[PDB]
Ligand binder design. Structure first.
Ligand SMILES: *[C@@H]1O[C@H](C)[C@@H](NC(C)=O)[C@H](O[C@H]2O[C@H](CO)[C@H](O[C@H]3O[C@H](CO)[C@H](O[C@H]4O[C@H](CO)[C@H](O[C@H]5O[C@H](CO)[C@H](O[C@H]6O[C@H](CO)[C@H](O)[C@H](O)[C@H]6NC(C)=O)[C@H](O)[C@H]5NC(C)=O)[C@H](O[C@@H]5O[C@H](CO)[C@@H](O)[C@H](O)[C@H]5O)[C@H]4NC(C)=O)[C@H](O)[C@H]3NC(C)=O)[C@H](O)[C@H]2NC(C)=O)[C@H]1NC(C)=O
Length: 116
């Protein structure tokens, strides 16, 4: 009784899942690219340990258009795909795929919390 939803709004990049297969708590299934990979989540392709990329005038293409992998909420069963790759999608509202079986598990800690 749960539906797989992303964390942002952008465009599908890929799908590492199957129709009628099982899922895992934190298992990648979908992917969406957006102009916002959080300020404390994405680790970016690489870093600047030193003068290896010359950030002084390095390229910007290597630091943008990040991607957000959509991992299942909890192990169980996954249905089919509603949309396809290369198709723009909205925030969590996008119910491309849904998960069935198992109980509704939840235990994250990224951001957007009002429990203090
Ligand atoms: C997603 O993909 C992208 C493609 C990728 N980007 C690119 C371009 O490819 C993204 O990576 C980028 O973004 C991430 C995070 O979003 C990473 O950047 C973070 O980490 C960096 C270090 O590696 C930087 O942080 C450093 O600089 C800041 C200031 O801007 C902080 O330092 C300040 O504060 C300190 C403590 O308060 C010091 O100040 C104290 O000492 C002085 C000395 O006199 C004074 O007395 C002060 O008054 C003191 N403080 C107090 C309170 O009294 C420090 O000197 C000061 N700097 C300045 C200039 O003033 C930071 O340290 C943290 O600071 C906070 C509060 O400031 C403190 O609470 C923490 O304890 C402390 O850790 C510095 N850290 C280091 C290790 O040097 C970035 O600014 C930081 N981001 C943010 C939002 O803060 C990544 O490296 C980025 N890459 C590039 C190329 O830019 C990628 N990921 C994400 C998440 O987007």
């Amino acid at each position: 009784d749960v539906i797989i939803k992303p964390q942002v709004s952008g465009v599908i990049v890929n799908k590492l899942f199957k129709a009628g297969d099982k899922v895992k708590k934190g298992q990648t299934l979908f992917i969406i690219e957006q102009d916002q990979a959080s300020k404390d989540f994405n680790r970016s392709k690489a870093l600047f340990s030193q003068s290896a990329i010359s950030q002084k005038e390095y390229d910007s293409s290597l630091a943008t258009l990040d991607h957000t992998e959509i991992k299942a909420p909890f192990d169980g069963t996954i249905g089919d795909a509603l949309v396809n790759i290369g198709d723009y999608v909205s925030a969590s509202t996008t119910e491309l795929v849904r998960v069935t079986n198992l109980n509704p598990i939840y235990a994250d800690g990224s951001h957007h919390h009002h429990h203090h």
